[PDB]
Amino acid sequence: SKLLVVKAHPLTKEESRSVRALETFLASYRETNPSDEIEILDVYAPETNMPEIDEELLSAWGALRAGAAFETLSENQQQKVARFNELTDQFLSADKVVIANPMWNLNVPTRLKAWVDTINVAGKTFQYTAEGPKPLTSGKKALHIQSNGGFYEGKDFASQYIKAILNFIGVDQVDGLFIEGIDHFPDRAEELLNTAMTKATEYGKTF
Amino acid sequence: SKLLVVKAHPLTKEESRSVRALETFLASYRETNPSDEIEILDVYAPETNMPEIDEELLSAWGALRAGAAFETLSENQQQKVARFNELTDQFLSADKVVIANPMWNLNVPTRLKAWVDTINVAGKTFQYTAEGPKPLTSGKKALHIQSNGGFYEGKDFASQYIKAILNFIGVDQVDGLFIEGIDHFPDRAEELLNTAMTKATEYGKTF
Ligand SMILES: Cc1cc2nc3c(=O)[nH]c(=O)nc-3n(C[C@H](O)[C@H](O)[C@H](O)COP(=O)(O)O)c2cc1C
Ligand SMILES: Cc1cc2nc3c(=O)[nH]c(=O)nc-3n(C[C@H](O)[C@H](O)[C@H](O)COP(=O)(O)O)c2cc1C
């Protein structure tokens, strides 16, 4: 019932194949699951106030490990700490997650790594046990929508990373939708885009 | 001759294992090579102003590709484009590169990814061809100094990624110094840090 949308592309559907496939997935998803809550997290939007692990955050977390009151932190630390935590709890609230990004230099875009930093939290999404770390979520589903220049066989670093992280925190069902290969064969744009658009709609009906 | 230092950690040597190893290495390197130019890029410092690939940047490149004059872009787009290029030229100008970062969630810090984005540039560090993409750089050397919570047999995503990018652009010599396992074995802190320190000084002497 709650679908979190992580939009990890700075542009809109008109400029982006990742975002276009996201939008056709979501139209199909909404029509198929009219009662589901759909929450959008646009990690590039200025309004989102995306936290970044930085000096103030690392030190806020030390200051709290030590035992300062959340009120001994600067206004700007308390804000970052609380914003970071909002993002973790948002993930925890979601039954399903859809992530949309382009492949940029064989890794996730910077703001997508920043979002991943919020979902890997000891005592929140995973825990330390005598047998090693163990997930703290179960029953979540994820869909990774990503556009690549070339054809990777789901074997690119970015999609493997997203899957490993999601698997670590207990998201065992990870689907992919990859819009690939148009940069290599621009003359197959209509055909590849059509294939991707129909796969997006179909995920809308089954995810 | 010219050593570029990429420090990708928000904290100082007093609070960071990878920064402490970096500083040991640098002290030993300057002693060994007093004539070499040592330029520091601290990706987290206030002064740095490193762009990330975002809407303003992408739309700037888009406008330039459409034939618009640099001077027609917004003042901040012009700043962003120029800074991004300055970063790429800095890498091209270095004979040797040392990168120092902690491992955060099996991957590099967000701003280190932002720095990799400035070094993997069609027409400056690699090129597309009929045979495949090919490097545009020759003769460089790299040292990757990274601290990890557990023991990765150089097999972690972050250091594999860093090695992948460097090799792709023509840097065939990529050395590693990994300060690992202290989070698992705090009682071994003294020994593990001393070992790392000796390797960092030895790299200063031989790199
Ligand atoms: C900064 C930059 C880096 C890129 N790096 C890669 C790369 O690692 N591998 C690849 O196959 N394509 C790469 N591409 C090409 C895009 O992945 C391809 O254009 C993609 O279809 C864009 O998705 P989008 O339309 O949602 O932006 C890169 C493109 C840009 C702008
Ligand atoms: C945000 C965060 C994420 C981390 N993620 C990992 C992880 O993916 N794997 C791991 O082994 N250690 C992880 N650690 C532990 C650090 O890699 C480890 O403490 C390392 O020695 C820190 O290096 P530094 O002293 O230079 O900061 C993480 C620590 C933090 C602060």
Side-chain angles (χ1 to χ4, degrees), chain B residues 7-39:
Chain B
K7 171 190 174 257
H9 199 300
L11 312 185
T12 64
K13 80 203 173 161
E14 291 89 16
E15 327 153 80
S16 159
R17 286 149 191 163
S18 57
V19 183
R20 178 77 195 155
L22 173 65
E23 285 290 305
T24 301
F25 164 72
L26 290 173
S28 167
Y29 192 92
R30 288 162 157 142
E31 163 185 296
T32 305
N33 309 283
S35 297
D36 282 358
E37 187 187 0
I38 306 327
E39 186 155 82

mmCIF file of all heavy atoms in Angstrom, chain B residues 7-39:
data_model
loop_
_atom_site.group_PDB
_atom_site.id
_atom_site.type_symbol
_atom_site.label_atom_id
_atom_site.label_comp_id
_atom_site.label_asym_id
_atom_site.label_seq_id
_atom_site.Cartn_x
_atom_site.Cartn_y
_atom_site.Cartn_z
ATOM 1 N N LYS B 7 41.818 14.535 -1.354
ATOM 2 C CA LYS B 7 41.418 14.162 -0.006
ATOM 3 C C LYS B 7 39.903 14.152 -0.031
ATOM 4 O O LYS B 7 39.256 15.206 -0.232
ATOM 5 C CB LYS B 7 41.926 15.145 1.038
ATOM 6 C CG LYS B 7 41.339 14.920 2.449
ATOM 7 C CD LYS B 7 41.683 16.082 3.448
ATOM 8 C CE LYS B 7 40.958 15.912 4.833
ATOM 9 N NZ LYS B 7 39.750 16.844 4.998
ATOM 10 N N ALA B 8 39.325 12.974 0.126
ATOM 11 C CA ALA B 8 37.878 12.864 0.109
ATOM 12 C C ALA B 8 37.438 12.319 1.459
ATOM 13 O O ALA B 8 36.959 11.215 1.567
ATOM 14 C CB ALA B 8 37.383 11.992 -1.045
ATOM 15 N N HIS B 9 37.622 13.147 2.484
ATOM 16 C CA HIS B 9 37.161 12.854 3.809
ATOM 17 C C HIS B 9 36.859 14.192 4.435
ATOM 18 O O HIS B 9 37.713 15.093 4.365
ATOM 19 C CB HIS B 9 38.274 12.222 4.658
ATOM 20 C CG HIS B 9 37.740 11.488 5.849
ATOM 21 N ND1 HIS B 9 36.986 12.099 6.832
ATOM 22 C CD2 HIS B 9 37.795 10.175 6.176
ATOM 23 C CE1 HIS B 9 36.609 11.199 7.723
ATOM 24 N NE2 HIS B 9 37.093 10.023 7.355
ATOM 25 N N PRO B 10 35.679 14.331 5.094
ATOM 26 C CA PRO B 10 35.381 15.601 5.754
ATOM 27 C C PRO B 10 36.245 15.942 6.976
ATOM 28 O O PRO B 10 36.264 17.127 7.361
ATOM 29 C CB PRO B 10 33.909 15.418 6.201
ATOM 30 C CG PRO B 10 33.364 14.287 5.391
ATOM 31 C CD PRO B 10 34.555 13.384 5.228
ATOM 32 N N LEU B 11 36.937 14.965 7.577
ATOM 33 C CA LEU B 11 37.620 15.205 8.866
ATOM 34 C C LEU B 11 39.136 15.284 8.714
ATOM 35 O O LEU B 11 39.643 15.176 7.602
ATOM 36 C CB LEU B 11 37.204 14.151 9.900
ATOM 37 C CG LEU B 11 35.709 13.858 10.061
ATOM 38 C CD1 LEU B 11 35.553 12.851 11.241
ATOM 39 C CD2 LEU B 11 34.858 15.117 10.300
ATOM 40 N N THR B 12 39.853 15.509 9.814
ATOM 41 C CA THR B 12 41.296 15.683 9.780
ATOM 42 C C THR B 12 41.978 14.392 10.228
ATOM 43 O O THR B 12 41.304 13.456 10.646
ATOM 44 C CB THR B 12 41.777 16.830 10.709
ATOM 45 O OG1 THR B 12 41.469 16.494 12.073
ATOM 46 C CG2 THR B 12 41.083 18.116 10.356
ATOM 47 N N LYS B 13 43.320 14.389 10.195
ATOM 48 C CA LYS B 13 44.131 13.218 10.576
ATOM 49 C C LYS B 13 43.904 12.826 12.047
ATOM 50 O O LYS B 13 44.050 11.662 12.436
ATOM 51 C CB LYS B 13 45.624 13.470 10.270
ATOM 52 C CG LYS B 13 46.397 14.314 11.287
ATOM 53 C CD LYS B 13 47.659 14.965 10.634
ATOM 54 C CE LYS B 13 48.370 15.960 11.590
ATOM 55 N NZ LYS B 13 49.807 16.187 11.113
ATOM 56 N N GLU B 14 43.497 13.794 12.848
ATOM 57 C CA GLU B 14 43.219 13.535 14.246
ATOM 58 C C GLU B 14 41.975 12.683 14.446
ATOM 59 O O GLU B 14 41.868 11.998 15.462
ATOM 60 C CB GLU B 14 43.146 14.877 15.015
ATOM 61 C CG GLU B 14 44.519 15.608 15.133
ATOM 62 C CD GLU B 14 44.857 16.586 13.954
ATOM 63 O OE1 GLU B 14 43.964 16.984 13.168
ATOM 64 O OE2 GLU B 14 46.039 16.992 13.832
ATOM 65 N N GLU B 15 41.040 12.688 13.480
ATOM 66 C CA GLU B 15 39.787 11.926 13.624
ATOM 67 C C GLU B 15 39.606 10.841 12.537
ATOM 68 O O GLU B 15 38.615 10.171 12.525
ATOM 69 C CB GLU B 15 38.574 12.889 13.566
ATOM 70 C CG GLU B 15 38.858 14.291 14.160
ATOM 71 C CD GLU B 15 37.978 15.374 13.549
ATOM 72 O OE1 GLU B 15 36.813 15.433 14.009
ATOM 73 O OE2 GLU B 15 38.422 16.132 12.613
ATOM 74 N N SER B 16 40.564 10.692 11.615
ATOM 75 C CA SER B 16 40.355 9.797 10.475
ATOM 76 C C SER B 16 41.579 8.919 10.251
ATOM 77 O O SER B 16 42.699 9.431 10.127
ATOM 78 C CB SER B 16 40.068 10.607 9.202
ATOM 79 O OG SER B 16 40.327 9.838 8.017
ATOM 80 N N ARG B 17 41.357 7.626 10.195
ATOM 81 C CA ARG B 17 42.414 6.656 9.836
ATOM 82 C C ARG B 17 42.952 6.860 8.396
ATOM 83 O O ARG B 17 44.174 6.771 8.131
ATOM 84 C CB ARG B 17 41.824 5.257 9.919
ATOM 85 C CG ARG B 17 41.614 4.768 11.355
ATOM 86 C CD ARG B 17 40.428 3.850 11.364
ATOM 87 N NE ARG B 17 39.978 3.538 12.722
ATOM 88 C CZ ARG B 17 38.782 3.031 13.026
ATOM 89 N NH1 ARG B 17 37.871 2.823 12.065
ATOM 90 N NH2 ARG B 17 38.480 2.757 14.304
ATOM 91 N N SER B 18 42.051 7.072 7.448
ATOM 92 C CA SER B 18 42.590 7.303 6.088
ATOM 93 C C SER B 18 43.306 8.645 5.915
ATOM 94 O O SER B 18 44.267 8.730 5.182
ATOM 95 C CB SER B 18 41.540 7.058 5.007
ATOM 96 O OG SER B 18 40.418 7.867 5.215
ATOM 97 N N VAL B 19 42.858 9.688 6.627
ATOM 98 C CA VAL B 19 43.525 10.957 6.565
ATOM 99 C C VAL B 19 44.873 10.891 7.270
ATOM 100 O O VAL B 19 45.813 11.470 6.783
ATOM 101 C CB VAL B 19 42.641 12.177 7.020
ATOM 102 C CG1 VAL B 19 43.407 13.501 6.853
ATOM 103 C CG2 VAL B 19 41.342 12.265 6.162
ATOM 104 N N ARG B 20 44.971 10.174 8.397
ATOM 105 C CA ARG B 20 46.257 10.002 9.108
ATOM 106 C C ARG B 20 47.303 9.288 8.223
ATOM 107 O O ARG B 20 48.475 9.706 8.138
ATOM 108 C CB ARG B 20 46.029 9.237 10.435
ATOM 109 C CG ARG B 20 47.343 8.938 11.260
ATOM 110 C CD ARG B 20 47.822 10.170 12.000
ATOM 111 N NE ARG B 20 49.200 9.945 12.444
ATOM 112 C CZ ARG B 20 50.089 10.908 12.687
ATOM 113 N NH1 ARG B 20 49.737 12.202 12.532
ATOM 114 N NH2 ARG B 20 51.332 10.574 13.071
ATOM 115 N N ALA B 21 46.873 8.229 7.543
ATOM 116 C CA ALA B 21 47.711 7.505 6.564
ATOM 117 C C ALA B 21 48.113 8.403 5.394
ATOM 118 O O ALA B 21 49.288 8.374 4.952
ATOM 119 C CB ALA B 21 46.979 6.281 6.037
ATOM 120 N N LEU B 22 47.151 9.189 4.898
ATOM 121 C CA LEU B 22 47.478 10.209 3.853
ATOM 122 C C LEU B 22 48.596 11.188 4.281
ATOM 123 O O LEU B 22 49.554 11.474 3.535
ATOM 124 C CB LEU B 22 46.249 11.000 3.414
ATOM 125 C CG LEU B 22 46.518 12.199 2.464
ATOM 126 C CD1 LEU B 22 47.084 11.722 1.076
ATOM 127 C CD2 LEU B 22 45.244 13.001 2.309
ATOM 128 N N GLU B 23 48.462 11.712 5.469
ATOM 129 C CA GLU B 23 49.434 12.672 5.989
ATOM 130 C C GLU B 23 50.801 12.057 6.231
ATOM 131 O O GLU B 23 51.806 12.685 5.923
ATOM 132 C CB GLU B 23 48.884 13.293 7.271
ATOM 133 C CG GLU B 23 47.789 14.321 6.930
ATOM 134 C CD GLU B 23 48.398 15.560 6.270
ATOM 135 O OE1 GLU B 23 49.309 16.164 6.868
ATOM 136 O OE2 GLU B 23 47.975 15.936 5.164
ATOM 137 N N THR B 24 50.837 10.834 6.759
ATOM 138 C CA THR B 24 52.109 10.084 6.877
ATOM 139 C C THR B 24 52.743 9.910 5.496
ATOM 140 O O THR B 24 53.932 10.172 5.306
ATOM 141 C CB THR B 24 51.909 8.708 7.540
ATOM 142 O OG1 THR B 24 51.349 8.905 8.844
ATOM 143 C CG2 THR B 24 53.302 7.885 7.610
ATOM 144 N N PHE B 25 51.957 9.429 4.533
ATOM 145 C CA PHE B 25 52.430 9.270 3.187
ATOM 146 C C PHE B 25 53.000 10.598 2.618
ATOM 147 O O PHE B 25 54.093 10.618 2.035
ATOM 148 C CB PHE B 25 51.296 8.777 2.262
ATOM 149 C CG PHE B 25 51.605 8.961 0.827
ATOM 150 C CD1 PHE B 25 52.539 8.160 0.215
ATOM 151 C CD2 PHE B 25 50.998 9.992 0.103
ATOM 152 C CE1 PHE B 25 52.879 8.368 -1.130
ATOM 153 C CE2 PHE B 25 51.336 10.220 -1.213
ATOM 154 C CZ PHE B 25 52.242 9.388 -1.846
ATOM 155 N N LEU B 26 52.235 11.688 2.780
ATOM 156 C CA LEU B 26 52.656 13.016 2.250
ATOM 157 C C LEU B 26 53.931 13.508 2.888
ATOM 158 O O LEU B 26 54.791 14.034 2.214
ATOM 159 C CB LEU B 26 51.568 14.094 2.426
ATOM 160 C CG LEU B 26 50.339 13.914 1.546
ATOM 161 C CD1 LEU B 26 49.244 14.952 1.947
ATOM 162 C CD2 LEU B 26 50.841 14.063 0.095
ATOM 163 N N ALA B 27 54.042 13.370 4.195
ATOM 164 C CA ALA B 27 55.251 13.804 4.865
ATOM 165 C C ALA B 27 56.474 13.046 4.307
ATOM 166 O O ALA B 27 57.491 13.669 3.965
ATOM 167 C CB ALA B 27 55.127 13.693 6.424
ATOM 168 N N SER B 28 56.330 11.718 4.144
ATOM 169 C CA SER B 28 57.374 10.901 3.625
ATOM 170 C C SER B 28 57.659 11.206 2.138
ATOM 171 O O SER B 28 58.813 11.263 1.750
ATOM 172 C CB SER B 28 57.092 9.409 3.904
ATOM 173 O OG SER B 28 57.946 8.566 3.166
ATOM 174 N N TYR B 29 56.605 11.401 1.323
ATOM 175 C CA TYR B 29 56.755 11.828 -0.047
ATOM 176 C C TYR B 29 57.484 13.196 -0.198
ATOM 177 O O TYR B 29 58.367 13.316 -1.039
ATOM 178 C CB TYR B 29 55.406 11.904 -0.774
ATOM 179 C CG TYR B 29 55.553 12.053 -2.241
ATOM 180 C CD1 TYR B 29 55.572 10.923 -3.073
ATOM 181 C CD2 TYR B 29 55.732 13.325 -2.825
ATOM 182 C CE1 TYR B 29 55.714 11.058 -4.448
ATOM 183 C CE2 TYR B 29 55.900 13.466 -4.188
ATOM 184 C CZ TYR B 29 55.891 12.353 -4.988
ATOM 185 O OH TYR B 29 56.047 12.517 -6.334
ATOM 186 N N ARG B 30 57.105 14.221 0.566
ATOM 187 C CA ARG B 30 57.800 15.510 0.440
ATOM 188 C C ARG B 30 59.278 15.394 0.824
ATOM 189 O O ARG B 30 60.123 15.993 0.172
ATOM 190 C CB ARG B 30 57.122 16.618 1.256
ATOM 191 C CG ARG B 30 55.794 17.083 0.657
ATOM 192 C CD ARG B 30 54.979 17.834 1.723
ATOM 193 N NE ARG B 30 53.998 18.731 1.114
ATOM 194 C CZ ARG B 30 52.781 18.940 1.594
ATOM 195 N NH1 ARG B 30 52.379 18.291 2.690
ATOM 196 N NH2 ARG B 30 51.962 19.789 0.980
ATOM 197 N N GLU B 31 59.580 14.627 1.871
ATOM 198 C CA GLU B 31 60.975 14.364 2.287
ATOM 199 C C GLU B 31 61.770 13.674 1.184
ATOM 200 O O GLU B 31 62.921 14.038 0.928
ATOM 201 C CB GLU B 31 61.014 13.561 3.612
ATOM 202 C CG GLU B 31 62.344 12.877 3.923
ATOM 203 C CD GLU B 31 62.282 11.996 5.197
ATOM 204 O OE1 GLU B 31 62.059 12.569 6.282
ATOM 205 O OE2 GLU B 31 62.434 10.727 5.083
ATOM 206 N N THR B 32 61.138 12.715 0.499
ATOM 207 C CA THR B 32 61.783 11.945 -0.557
ATOM 208 C C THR B 32 61.937 12.752 -1.839
ATOM 209 O O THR B 32 62.875 12.539 -2.595
ATOM 210 C CB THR B 32 61.039 10.580 -0.820
ATOM 211 O OG1 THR B 32 60.948 9.858 0.411
ATOM 212 C CG2 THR B 32 61.800 9.705 -1.799
ATOM 213 N N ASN B 33 60.993 13.654 -2.097
ATOM 214 C CA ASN B 33 60.910 14.317 -3.375
ATOM 215 C C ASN B 33 60.715 15.834 -3.154
ATOM 216 O O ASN B 33 59.691 16.395 -3.565
ATOM 217 C CB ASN B 33 59.782 13.716 -4.255
ATOM 218 C CG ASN B 33 59.846 12.167 -4.381
ATOM 219 O OD1 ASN B 33 60.659 11.629 -5.130
ATOM 220 N ND2 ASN B 33 58.952 11.461 -3.668
ATOM 221 N N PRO B 34 61.714 16.498 -2.524
ATOM 222 C CA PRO B 34 61.533 17.920 -2.159
ATOM 223 C C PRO B 34 61.326 18.880 -3.346
ATOM 224 O O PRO B 34 60.849 19.962 -3.129
ATOM 225 C CB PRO B 34 62.794 18.257 -1.336
ATOM 226 C CG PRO B 34 63.816 17.206 -1.719
ATOM 227 C CD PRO B 34 63.061 15.984 -2.160
ATOM 228 N N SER B 35 61.649 18.473 -4.570
ATOM 229 C CA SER B 35 61.445 19.304 -5.779
ATOM 230 C C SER B 35 60.056 19.189 -6.443
ATOM 231 O O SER B 35 59.698 19.986 -7.331
ATOM 232 C CB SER B 35 62.495 18.944 -6.827
ATOM 233 O OG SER B 35 63.801 19.235 -6.338
ATOM 234 N N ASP B 36 59.288 18.173 -6.031
ATOM 235 C CA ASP B 36 57.993 17.880 -6.676
ATOM 236 C C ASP B 36 56.943 18.858 -6.209
ATOM 237 O O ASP B 36 56.904 19.223 -5.069
ATOM 238 C CB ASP B 36 57.557 16.431 -6.380
ATOM 239 C CG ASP B 36 58.284 15.416 -7.227
ATOM 240 O OD1 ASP B 36 59.105 15.824 -8.079
ATOM 241 O OD2 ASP B 36 58.018 14.204 -7.082
ATOM 242 N N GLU B 37 56.080 19.266 -7.114
ATOM 243 C CA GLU B 37 54.919 20.077 -6.752
ATOM 244 C C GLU B 37 53.795 19.193 -6.160
ATOM 245 O O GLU B 37 53.351 18.253 -6.837
ATOM 246 C CB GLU B 37 54.402 20.772 -8.010
ATOM 247 C CG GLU B 37 53.290 21.793 -7.729
ATOM 248 C CD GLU B 37 52.674 22.339 -9.018
ATOM 249 O OE1 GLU B 37 53.118 21.906 -10.126
ATOM 250 O OE2 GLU B 37 51.740 23.180 -8.901
ATOM 251 N N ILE B 38 53.381 19.490 -4.922
ATOM 252 C CA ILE B 38 52.263 18.834 -4.224
ATOM 253 C C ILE B 38 51.000 19.725 -4.162
ATOM 254 O O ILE B 38 50.941 20.678 -3.331
ATOM 255 C CB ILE B 38 52.626 18.446 -2.749
ATOM 256 C CG1 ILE B 38 53.911 17.580 -2.652
ATOM 257 C CG2 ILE B 38 51.418 17.761 -2.034
ATOM 258 C CD1 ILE B 38 54.127 16.643 -3.807
ATOM 259 N N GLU B 39 50.008 19.435 -5.020
ATOM 260 C CA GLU B 39 48.721 20.160 -5.031
ATOM 261 C C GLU B 39 47.621 19.337 -4.385
ATOM 262 O O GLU B 39 47.423 18.165 -4.715
ATOM 263 C CB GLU B 39 48.334 20.476 -6.466
ATOM 264 C CG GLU B 39 47.097 21.334 -6.614
ATOM 265 C CD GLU B 39 47.159 22.070 -7.926
ATOM 266 O OE1 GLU B 39 46.813 21.465 -8.951
ATOM 267 O OE2 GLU B 39 47.639 23.227 -7.936
#
